[PDB]
Coordinates of C-alpha atoms in Angstrom, one line a residue:
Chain A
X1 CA 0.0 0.0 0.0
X2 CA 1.7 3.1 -1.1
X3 CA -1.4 5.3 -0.5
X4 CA -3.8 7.6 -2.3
X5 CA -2.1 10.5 -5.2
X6 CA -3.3 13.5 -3.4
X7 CA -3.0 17.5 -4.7
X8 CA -0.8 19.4 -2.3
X9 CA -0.9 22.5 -4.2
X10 CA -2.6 23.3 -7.8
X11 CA -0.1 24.0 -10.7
X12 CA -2.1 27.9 -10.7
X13 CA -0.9 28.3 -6.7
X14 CA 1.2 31.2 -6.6
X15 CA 2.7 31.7 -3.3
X16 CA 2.0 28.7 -0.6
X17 CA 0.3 29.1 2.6
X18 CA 2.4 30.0 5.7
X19 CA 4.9 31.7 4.2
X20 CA 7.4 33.6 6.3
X21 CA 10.8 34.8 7.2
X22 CA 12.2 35.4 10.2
X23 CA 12.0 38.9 8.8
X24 CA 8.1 38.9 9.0
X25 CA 6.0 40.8 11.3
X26 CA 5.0 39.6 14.5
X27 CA 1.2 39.0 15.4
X28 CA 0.5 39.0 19.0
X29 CA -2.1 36.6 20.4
X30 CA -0.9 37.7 25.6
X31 CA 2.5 40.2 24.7
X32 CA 4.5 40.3 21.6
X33 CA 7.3 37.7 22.5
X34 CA 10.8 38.9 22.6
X35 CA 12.2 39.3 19.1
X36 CA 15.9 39.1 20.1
X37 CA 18.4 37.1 17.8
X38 CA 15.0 36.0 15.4
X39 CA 15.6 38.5 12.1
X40 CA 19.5 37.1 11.7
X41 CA 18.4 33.1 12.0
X42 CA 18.8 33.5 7.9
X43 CA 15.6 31.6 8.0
X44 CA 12.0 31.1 6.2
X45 CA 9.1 28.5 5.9
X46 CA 6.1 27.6 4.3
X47 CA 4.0 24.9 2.9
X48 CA 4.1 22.7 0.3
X49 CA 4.5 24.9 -2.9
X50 CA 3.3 24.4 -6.8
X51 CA 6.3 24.9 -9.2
X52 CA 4.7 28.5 -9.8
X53 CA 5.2 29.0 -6.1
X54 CA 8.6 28.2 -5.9
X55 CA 9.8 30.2 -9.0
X56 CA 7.8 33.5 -7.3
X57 CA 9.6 32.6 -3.7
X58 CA 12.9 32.8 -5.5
X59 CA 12.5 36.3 -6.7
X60 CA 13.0 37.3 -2.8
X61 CA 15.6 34.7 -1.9
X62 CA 19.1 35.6 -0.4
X63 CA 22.2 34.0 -3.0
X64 CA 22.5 30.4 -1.6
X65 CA 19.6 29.6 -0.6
X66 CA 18.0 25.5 0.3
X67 CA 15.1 24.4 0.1
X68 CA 15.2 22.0 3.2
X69 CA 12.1 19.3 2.3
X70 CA 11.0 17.7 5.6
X71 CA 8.5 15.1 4.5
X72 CA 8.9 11.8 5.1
X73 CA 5.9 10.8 2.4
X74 CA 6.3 10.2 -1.3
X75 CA 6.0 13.8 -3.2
X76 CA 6.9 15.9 -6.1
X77 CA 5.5 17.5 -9.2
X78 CA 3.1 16.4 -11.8
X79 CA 3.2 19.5 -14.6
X80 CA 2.8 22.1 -12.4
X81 CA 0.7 20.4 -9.6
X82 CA 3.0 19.1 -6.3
X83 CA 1.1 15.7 -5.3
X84 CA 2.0 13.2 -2.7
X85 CA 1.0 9.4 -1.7
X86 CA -1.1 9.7 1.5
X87 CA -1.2 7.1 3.6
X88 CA -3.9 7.3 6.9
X89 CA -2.7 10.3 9.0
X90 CA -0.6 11.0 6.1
X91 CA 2.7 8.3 7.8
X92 CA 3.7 7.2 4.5
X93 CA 7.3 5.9 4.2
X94 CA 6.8 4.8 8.2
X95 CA 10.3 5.4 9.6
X96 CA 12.2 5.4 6.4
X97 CA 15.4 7.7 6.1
X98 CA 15.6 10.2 3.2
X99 CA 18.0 7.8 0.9
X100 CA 15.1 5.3 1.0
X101 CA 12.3 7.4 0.4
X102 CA 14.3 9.4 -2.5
X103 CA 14.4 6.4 -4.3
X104 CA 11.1 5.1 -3.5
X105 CA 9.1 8.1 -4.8
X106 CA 11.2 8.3 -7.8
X107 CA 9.7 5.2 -8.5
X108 CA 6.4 6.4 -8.2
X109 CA 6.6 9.9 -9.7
X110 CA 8.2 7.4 -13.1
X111 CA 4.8 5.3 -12.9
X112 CA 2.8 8.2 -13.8
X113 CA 5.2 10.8 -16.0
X114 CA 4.0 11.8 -19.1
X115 CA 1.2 9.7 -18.7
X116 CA -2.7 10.1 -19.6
X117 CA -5.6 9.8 -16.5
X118 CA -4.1 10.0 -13.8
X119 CA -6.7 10.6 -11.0
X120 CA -5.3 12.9 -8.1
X121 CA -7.9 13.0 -5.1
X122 CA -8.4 16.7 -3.6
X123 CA -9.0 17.3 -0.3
X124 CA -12.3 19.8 0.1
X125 CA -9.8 22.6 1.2
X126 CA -7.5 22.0 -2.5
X127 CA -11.2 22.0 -4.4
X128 CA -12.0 18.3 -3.6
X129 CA -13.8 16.2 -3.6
X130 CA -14.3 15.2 -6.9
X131 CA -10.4 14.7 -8.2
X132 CA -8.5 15.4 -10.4
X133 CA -7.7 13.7 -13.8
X134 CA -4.4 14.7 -15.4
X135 CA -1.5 13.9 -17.8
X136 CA 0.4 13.5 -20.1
X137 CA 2.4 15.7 -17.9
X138 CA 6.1 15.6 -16.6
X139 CA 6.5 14.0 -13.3
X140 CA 9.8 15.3 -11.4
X141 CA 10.9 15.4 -7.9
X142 CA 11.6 18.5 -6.0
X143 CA 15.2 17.9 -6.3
X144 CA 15.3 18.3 -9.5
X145 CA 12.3 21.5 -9.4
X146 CA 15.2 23.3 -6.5
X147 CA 18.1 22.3 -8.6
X148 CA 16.1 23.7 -12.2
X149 CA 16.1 27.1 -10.2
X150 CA 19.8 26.9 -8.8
X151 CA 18.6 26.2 -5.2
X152 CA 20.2 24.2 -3.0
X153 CA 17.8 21.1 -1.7
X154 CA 18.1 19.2 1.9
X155 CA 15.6 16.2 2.5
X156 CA 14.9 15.4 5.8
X157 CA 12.3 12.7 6.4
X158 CA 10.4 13.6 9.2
X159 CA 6.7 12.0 9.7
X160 CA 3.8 14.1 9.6
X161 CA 2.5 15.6 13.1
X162 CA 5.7 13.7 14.2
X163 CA 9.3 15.2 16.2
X164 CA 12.2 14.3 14.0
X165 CA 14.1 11.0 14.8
X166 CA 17.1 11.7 16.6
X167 CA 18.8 10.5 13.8
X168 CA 17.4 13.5 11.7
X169 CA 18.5 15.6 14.6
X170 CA 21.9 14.6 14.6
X171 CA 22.3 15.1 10.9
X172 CA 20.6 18.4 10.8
X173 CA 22.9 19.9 13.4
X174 CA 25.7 18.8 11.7
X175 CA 24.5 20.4 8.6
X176 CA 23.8 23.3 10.4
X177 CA 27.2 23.2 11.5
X178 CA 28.3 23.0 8.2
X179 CA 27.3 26.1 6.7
X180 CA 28.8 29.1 6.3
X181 CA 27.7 32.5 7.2
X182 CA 25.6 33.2 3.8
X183 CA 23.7 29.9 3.5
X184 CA 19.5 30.6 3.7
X185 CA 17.6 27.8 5.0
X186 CA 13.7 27.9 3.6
X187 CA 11.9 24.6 5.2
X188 CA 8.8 23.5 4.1
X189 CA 6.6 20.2 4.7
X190 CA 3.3 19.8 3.5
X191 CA 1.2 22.6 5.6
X192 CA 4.0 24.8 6.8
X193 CA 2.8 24.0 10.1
X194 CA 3.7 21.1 12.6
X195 CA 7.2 20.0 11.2
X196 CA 8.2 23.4 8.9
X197 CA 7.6 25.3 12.4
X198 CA 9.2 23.0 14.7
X199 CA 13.1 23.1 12.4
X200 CA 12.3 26.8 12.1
X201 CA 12.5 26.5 16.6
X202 CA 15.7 24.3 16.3
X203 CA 17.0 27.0 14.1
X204 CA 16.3 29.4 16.5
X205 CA 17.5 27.7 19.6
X206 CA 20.8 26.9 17.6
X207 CA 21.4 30.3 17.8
X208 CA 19.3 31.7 20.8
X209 CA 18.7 29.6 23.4
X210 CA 21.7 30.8 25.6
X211 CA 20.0 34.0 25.7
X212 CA 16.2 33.5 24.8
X213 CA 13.6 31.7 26.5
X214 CA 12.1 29.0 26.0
X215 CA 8.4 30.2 25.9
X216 CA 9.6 33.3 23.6
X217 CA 11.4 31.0 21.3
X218 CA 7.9 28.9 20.4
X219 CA 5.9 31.9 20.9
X220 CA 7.8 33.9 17.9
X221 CA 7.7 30.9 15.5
X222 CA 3.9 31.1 16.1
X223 CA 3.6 34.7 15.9
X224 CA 5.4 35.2 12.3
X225 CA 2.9 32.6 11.4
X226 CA 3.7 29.2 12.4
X227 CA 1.3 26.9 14.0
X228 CA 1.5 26.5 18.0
X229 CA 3.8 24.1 19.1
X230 CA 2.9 24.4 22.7
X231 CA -0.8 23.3 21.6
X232 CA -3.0 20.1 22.4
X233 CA -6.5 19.4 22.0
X234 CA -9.2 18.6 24.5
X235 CA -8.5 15.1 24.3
X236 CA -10.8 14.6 21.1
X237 CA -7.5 13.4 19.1
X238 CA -5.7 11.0 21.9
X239 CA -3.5 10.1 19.4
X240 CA -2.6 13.3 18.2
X241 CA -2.3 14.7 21.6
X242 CA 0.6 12.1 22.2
X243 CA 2.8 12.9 19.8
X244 CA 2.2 16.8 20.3
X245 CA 3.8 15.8 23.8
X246 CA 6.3 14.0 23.0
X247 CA 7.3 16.8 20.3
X248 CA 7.2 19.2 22.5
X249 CA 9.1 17.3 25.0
X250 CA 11.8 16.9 22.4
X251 CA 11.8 20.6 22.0
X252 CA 12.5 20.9 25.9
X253 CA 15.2 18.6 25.6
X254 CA 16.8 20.4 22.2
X255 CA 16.3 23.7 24.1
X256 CA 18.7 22.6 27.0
X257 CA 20.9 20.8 24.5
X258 CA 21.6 24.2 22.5
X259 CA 22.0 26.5 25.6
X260 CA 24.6 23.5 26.5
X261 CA 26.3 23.3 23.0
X262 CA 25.6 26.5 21.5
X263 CA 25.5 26.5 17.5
X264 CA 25.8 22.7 18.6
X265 CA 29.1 22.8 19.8
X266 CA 31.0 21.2 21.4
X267 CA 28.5 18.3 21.6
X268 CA 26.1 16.7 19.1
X269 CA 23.4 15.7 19.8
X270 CA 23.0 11.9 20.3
X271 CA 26.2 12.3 21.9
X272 CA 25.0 15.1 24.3
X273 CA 22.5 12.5 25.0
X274 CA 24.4 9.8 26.1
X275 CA 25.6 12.3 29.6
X276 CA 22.0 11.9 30.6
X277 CA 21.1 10.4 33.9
Chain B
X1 CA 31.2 -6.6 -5.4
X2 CA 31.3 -2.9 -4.6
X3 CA 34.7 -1.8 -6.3
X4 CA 37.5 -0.4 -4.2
X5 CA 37.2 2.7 -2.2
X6 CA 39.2 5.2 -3.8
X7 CA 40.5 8.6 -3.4
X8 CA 39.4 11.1 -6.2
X9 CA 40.8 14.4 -4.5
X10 CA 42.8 14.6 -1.2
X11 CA 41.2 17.3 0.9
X12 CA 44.0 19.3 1.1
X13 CA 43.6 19.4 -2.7
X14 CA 42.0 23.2 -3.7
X15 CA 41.3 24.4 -7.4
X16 CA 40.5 21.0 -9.1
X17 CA 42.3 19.6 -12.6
X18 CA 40.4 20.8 -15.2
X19 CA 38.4 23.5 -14.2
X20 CA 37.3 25.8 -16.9
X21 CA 34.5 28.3 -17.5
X22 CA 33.3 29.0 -20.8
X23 CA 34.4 32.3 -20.5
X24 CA 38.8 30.9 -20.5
X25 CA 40.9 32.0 -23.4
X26 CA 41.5 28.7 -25.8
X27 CA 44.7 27.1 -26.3
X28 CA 45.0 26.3 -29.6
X29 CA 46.2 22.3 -31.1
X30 CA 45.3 23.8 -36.2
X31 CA 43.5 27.1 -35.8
X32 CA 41.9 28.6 -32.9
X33 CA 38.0 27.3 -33.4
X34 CA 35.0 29.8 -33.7
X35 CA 34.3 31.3 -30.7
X36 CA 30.6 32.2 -31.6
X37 CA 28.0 31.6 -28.8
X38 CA 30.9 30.2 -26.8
X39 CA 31.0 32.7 -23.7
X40 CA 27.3 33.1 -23.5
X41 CA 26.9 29.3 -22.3
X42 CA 26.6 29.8 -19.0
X43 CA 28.5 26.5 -18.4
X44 CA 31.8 25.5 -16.9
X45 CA 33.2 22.2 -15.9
X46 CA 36.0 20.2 -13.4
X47 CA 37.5 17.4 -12.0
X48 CA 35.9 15.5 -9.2
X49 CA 36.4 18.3 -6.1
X50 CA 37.6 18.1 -2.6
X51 CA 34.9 20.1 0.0
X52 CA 37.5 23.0 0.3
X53 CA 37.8 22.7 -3.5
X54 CA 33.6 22.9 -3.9
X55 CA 34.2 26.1 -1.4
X56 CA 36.6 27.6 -3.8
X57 CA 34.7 27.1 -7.0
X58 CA 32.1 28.5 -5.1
X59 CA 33.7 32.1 -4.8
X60 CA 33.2 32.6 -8.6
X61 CA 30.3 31.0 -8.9
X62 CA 27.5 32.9 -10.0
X63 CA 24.2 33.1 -8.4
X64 CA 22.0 29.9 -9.0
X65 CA 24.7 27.9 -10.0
X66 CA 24.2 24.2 -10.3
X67 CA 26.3 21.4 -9.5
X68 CA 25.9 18.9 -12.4
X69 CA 27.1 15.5 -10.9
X70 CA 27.7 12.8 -14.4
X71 CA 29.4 10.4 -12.1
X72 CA 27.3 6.7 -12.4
X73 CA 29.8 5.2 -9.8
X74 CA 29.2 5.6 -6.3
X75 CA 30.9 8.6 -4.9
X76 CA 31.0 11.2 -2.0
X77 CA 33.4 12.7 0.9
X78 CA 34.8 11.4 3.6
X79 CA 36.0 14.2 5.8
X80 CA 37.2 16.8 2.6
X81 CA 38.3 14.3 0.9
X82 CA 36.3 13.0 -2.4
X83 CA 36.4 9.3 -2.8
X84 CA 34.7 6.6 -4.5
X85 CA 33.9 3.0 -5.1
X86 CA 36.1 2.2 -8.2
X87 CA 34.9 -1.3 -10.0
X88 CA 37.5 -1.9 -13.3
X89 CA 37.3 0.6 -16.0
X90 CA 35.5 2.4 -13.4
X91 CA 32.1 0.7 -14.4
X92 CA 30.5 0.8 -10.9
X93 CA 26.6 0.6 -10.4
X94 CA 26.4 -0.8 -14.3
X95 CA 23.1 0.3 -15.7
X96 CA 21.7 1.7 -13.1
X97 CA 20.0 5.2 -12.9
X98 CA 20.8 8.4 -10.8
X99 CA 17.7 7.0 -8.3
X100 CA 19.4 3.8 -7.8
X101 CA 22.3 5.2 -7.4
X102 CA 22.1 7.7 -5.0
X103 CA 20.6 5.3 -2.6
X104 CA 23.2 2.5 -3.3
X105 CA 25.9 5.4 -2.3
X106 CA 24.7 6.4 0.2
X107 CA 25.0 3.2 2.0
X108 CA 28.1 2.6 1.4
X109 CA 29.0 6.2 3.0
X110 CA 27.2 5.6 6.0
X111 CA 29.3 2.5 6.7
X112 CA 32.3 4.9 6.4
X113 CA 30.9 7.8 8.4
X114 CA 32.6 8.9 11.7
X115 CA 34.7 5.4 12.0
X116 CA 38.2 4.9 12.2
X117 CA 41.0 3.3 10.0
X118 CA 39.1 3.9 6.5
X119 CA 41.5 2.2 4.3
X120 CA 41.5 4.8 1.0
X121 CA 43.4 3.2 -2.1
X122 CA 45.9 5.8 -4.1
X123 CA 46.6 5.9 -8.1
X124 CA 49.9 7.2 -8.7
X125 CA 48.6 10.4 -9.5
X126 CA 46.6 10.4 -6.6
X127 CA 49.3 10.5 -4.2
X128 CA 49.3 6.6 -4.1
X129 CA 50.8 3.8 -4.7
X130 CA 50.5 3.4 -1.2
X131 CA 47.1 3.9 0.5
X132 CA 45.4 6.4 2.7
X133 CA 44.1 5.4 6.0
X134 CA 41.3 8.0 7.7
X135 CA 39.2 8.2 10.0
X136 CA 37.3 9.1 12.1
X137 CA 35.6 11.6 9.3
X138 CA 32.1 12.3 8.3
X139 CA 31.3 11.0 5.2
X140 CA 28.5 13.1 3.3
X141 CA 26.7 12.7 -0.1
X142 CA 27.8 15.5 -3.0
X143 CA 24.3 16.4 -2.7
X144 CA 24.2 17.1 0.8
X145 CA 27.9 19.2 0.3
X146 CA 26.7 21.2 -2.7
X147 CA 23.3 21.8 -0.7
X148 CA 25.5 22.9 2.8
X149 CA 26.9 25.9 0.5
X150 CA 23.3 26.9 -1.0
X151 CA 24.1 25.8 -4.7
X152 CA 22.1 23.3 -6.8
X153 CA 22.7 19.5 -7.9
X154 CA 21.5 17.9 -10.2
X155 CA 22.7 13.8 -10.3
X156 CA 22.6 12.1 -13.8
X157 CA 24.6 8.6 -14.1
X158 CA 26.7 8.7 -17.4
X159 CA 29.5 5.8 -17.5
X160 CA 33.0 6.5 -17.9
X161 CA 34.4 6.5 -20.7
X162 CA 30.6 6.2 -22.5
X163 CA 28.1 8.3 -23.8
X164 CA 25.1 9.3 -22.1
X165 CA 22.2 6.6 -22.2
X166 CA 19.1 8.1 -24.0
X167 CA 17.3 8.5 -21.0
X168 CA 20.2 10.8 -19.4
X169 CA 20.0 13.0 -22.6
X170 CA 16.5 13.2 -22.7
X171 CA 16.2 13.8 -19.0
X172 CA 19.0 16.3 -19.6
X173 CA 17.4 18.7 -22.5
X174 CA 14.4 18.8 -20.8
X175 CA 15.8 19.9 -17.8
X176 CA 18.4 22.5 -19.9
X177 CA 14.7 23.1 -21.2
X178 CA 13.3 24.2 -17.7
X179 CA 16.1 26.8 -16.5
X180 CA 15.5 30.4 -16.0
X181 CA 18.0 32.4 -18.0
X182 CA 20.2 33.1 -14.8
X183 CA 20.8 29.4 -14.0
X184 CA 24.6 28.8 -14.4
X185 CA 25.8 24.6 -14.6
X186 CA 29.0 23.2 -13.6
X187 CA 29.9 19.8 -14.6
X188 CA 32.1 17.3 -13.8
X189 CA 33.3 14.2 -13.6
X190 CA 36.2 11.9 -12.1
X191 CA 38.7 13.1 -14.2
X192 CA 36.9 16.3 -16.2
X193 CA 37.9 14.9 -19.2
X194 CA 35.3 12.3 -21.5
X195 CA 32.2 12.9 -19.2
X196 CA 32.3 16.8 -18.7
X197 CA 33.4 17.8 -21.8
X198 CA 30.7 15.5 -23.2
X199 CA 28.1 17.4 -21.3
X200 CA 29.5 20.8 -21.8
X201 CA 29.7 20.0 -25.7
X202 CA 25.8 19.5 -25.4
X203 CA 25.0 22.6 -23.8
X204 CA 27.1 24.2 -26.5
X205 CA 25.3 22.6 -29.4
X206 CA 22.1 23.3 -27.5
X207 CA 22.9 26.9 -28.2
X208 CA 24.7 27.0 -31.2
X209 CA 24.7 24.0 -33.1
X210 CA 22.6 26.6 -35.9
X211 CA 25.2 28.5 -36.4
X212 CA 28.4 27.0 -35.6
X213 CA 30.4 24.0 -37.1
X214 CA 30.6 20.4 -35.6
X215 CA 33.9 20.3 -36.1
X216 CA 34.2 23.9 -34.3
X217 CA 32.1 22.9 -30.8
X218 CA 34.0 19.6 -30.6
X219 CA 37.5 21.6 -30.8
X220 CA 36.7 24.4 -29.0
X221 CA 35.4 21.9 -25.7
X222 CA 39.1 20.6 -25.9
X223 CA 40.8 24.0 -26.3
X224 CA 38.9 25.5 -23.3
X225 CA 40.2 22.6 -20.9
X226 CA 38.1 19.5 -21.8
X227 CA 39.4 16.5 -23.4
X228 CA 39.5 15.5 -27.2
X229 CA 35.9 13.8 -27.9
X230 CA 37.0 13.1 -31.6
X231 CA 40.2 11.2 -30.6
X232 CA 40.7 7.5 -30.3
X233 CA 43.9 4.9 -29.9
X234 CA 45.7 3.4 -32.5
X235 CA 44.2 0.2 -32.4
X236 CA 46.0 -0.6 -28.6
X237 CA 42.7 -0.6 -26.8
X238 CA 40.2 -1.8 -28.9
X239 CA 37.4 -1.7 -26.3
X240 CA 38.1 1.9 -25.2
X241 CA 37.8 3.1 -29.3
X242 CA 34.6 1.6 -29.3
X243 CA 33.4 2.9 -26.5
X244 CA 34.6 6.7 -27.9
X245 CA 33.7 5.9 -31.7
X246 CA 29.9 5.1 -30.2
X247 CA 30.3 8.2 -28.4
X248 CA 31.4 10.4 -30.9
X249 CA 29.0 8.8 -33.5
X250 CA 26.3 10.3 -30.6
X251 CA 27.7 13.8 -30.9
X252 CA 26.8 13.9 -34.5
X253 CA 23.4 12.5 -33.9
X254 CA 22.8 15.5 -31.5
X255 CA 24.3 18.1 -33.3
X256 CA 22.2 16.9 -36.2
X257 CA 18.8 17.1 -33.0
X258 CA 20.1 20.3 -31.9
X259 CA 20.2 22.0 -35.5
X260 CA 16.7 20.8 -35.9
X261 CA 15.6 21.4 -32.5
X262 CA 17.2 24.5 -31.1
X263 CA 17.3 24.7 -27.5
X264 CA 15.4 21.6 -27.8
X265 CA 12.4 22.5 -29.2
X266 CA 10.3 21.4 -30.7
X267 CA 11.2 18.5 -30.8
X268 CA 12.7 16.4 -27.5
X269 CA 15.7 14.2 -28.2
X270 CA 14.0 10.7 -27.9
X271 CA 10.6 12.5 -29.9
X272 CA 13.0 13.5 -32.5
X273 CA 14.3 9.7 -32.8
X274 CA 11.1 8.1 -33.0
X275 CA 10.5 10.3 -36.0
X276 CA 13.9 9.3 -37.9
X277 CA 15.7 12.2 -37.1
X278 CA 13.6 14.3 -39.5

């Protein structure tokens, strides 16, 4: 089961939803968080974007700037259209690095390039429910979109409404590491919400939590218009609810981490783990 | 079998062999070939870089620059040093597409990564015959290198030694196809020489094939820095002519396209196949 093609973003989308910089306006919700060390994280977000969209983002990006992908699902472009394989609670690709999943969805995105008929569900929000029925159209990955434009491109596979594996932890902050002083990192996922806000945080701490706190750091990626990390439900979505708590948790952790090892230095991370009690 | 694991560039190594942009004066063999269309290519090529030689290159690159990756055998850094798994005649991952391959290398780097006495076989010119033990290093993907500096990669698996498979070309025009006019490609290779110049001679006859001579775009790659695509052996390694006669035998076939199809249009390479060439 490799799950339902799904539209992410029509090929006529322009700029995607949640789009921000750490340049953007703050909107207060409770006081306007502290903005200290946020406008030089060299950092934006947003969510999954149509080719369209990502040609019109490049008109205002820095030189050297990535496109860091976070989704651990099957995606990439059909013509214009980005479309991805949804499994239930969108956990396609279940705890599968970004080697395997590259190679898995370029699989998939052969299967139906320049190909006639091929249905794409909608979701009511994208124009659903009655799909789409495309093709022949050119089926590429967002690779190969990022490196068409001269952007650099990151995948990171990290599972919908999920924290990152510690593995993808410990390879981001050595890539973060990595970079010198004029690199731009744009994340996205498929919203722009759960795991586009929660790399835009690490980025942050990386480079404020010895002087910012906590509550200011997650309050800020909300306010330029991320979704609420600090959020639950009412217990409606148990599920849901659990691994909120256990990302935030990980957030508390990574917080102490980087005012330990700022920049993440000296320590990485799985090793800064292994001091614990 | 995974070949040998093989140093390409030592980190210490900066500039690497073979760079060129199209905008470097020509050394001439005969006359100095046309120049016409030559320095508005956009294009340059190398040698396989070290990290602090990608750092380098990167100086003078110019915005939205692309790293154009044609190696088919698996390759990446360990520490800054470039390395790679070498089967004979350099024929790793046989057949096998830029998907397969960049998951089949990166596998065999993370095996590598952070661990200690990495055992590295030398050439000669390399710095060898003896080996190079290393370690503990991290050991990265090009892709992830080129994306750590903000610049673009683009993998396509081309043999050495061999022309590009049909697929590789067609996947290749389209995407010369797809760029915005700013977008600046840097190839390479192992060695810089049959794979890079290959590719640069494409984007060339992408451009110009209308209005320049075969014979000019072939010479002109070489006198820039590239190799000589219309040379071959006397006979002493029969296998190796083949493999450049089928090659060169291409290059006419997609000057032919290109003169046709500027840019690549209308016309895609395979499209313009199926229909006989014309």
């Amino acid at each position: 089961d490799v799950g339902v093609l799904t539209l992410d973003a029509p090929a006529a989308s322009a700029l995607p939803h949640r789009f921000r910089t750490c340049f953007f306006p703050l909107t207060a919700s409770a006081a306007v968080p502290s903005r200290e060390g946020l406008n030089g994280l060299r950092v934006s977000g947003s969510s999954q974007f149509s080719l369209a969209g990502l040609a019109l983002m490049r008109e205002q990006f820095p030189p050297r700037a990535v496109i860091v992908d976070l989704r651990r699902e099957s995606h990439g472009f059909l013509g214009g259209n980005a479309v991805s394989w949804r499994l239930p609670d969108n956990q396609g690709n279940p705890g599968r690095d970004a080697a395997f999943v590259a190679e898995a969805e370029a699989a998939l995105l052969a299967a139906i390039d320049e190909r006639p008929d091929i249905v794409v569900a909608r979701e009511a929000r994208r124009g659903g429910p009655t799909p789409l029925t495309l093709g022949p159209l050119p089926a590429v990955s967002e690779a190969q979109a990022a490196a068409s434009l001269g952007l650099g491109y990151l995948r990171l596979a990290v599972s919908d409404h999920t924290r990152p594996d510690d593995a993808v932890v410990e390879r981001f902050v050595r890539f973060s590491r990595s970079l010198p002083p004029d690199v731009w990192l744009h994340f996205h996922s498929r919203g722009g919400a759960g795991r586009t806000t929660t790399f835009m945080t690490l980025v942050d701490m990386l480079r404020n939590a010895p002087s910012v706190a906590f509550e200011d750091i997650i309050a800020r990626q909300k306010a330029l218009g991320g979704s609420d990390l600090a959020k639950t439900s009412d217990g409606s979505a148990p599920g849901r609810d659990a691994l909120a708590r256990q990302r935030l948790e990980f957030l508390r952790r990574f917080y102490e981490y980087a005012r330990a090892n700022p920049g993440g230095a000296p320590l990485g991370w799985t090793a800064w783990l292994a001091g614990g009690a």
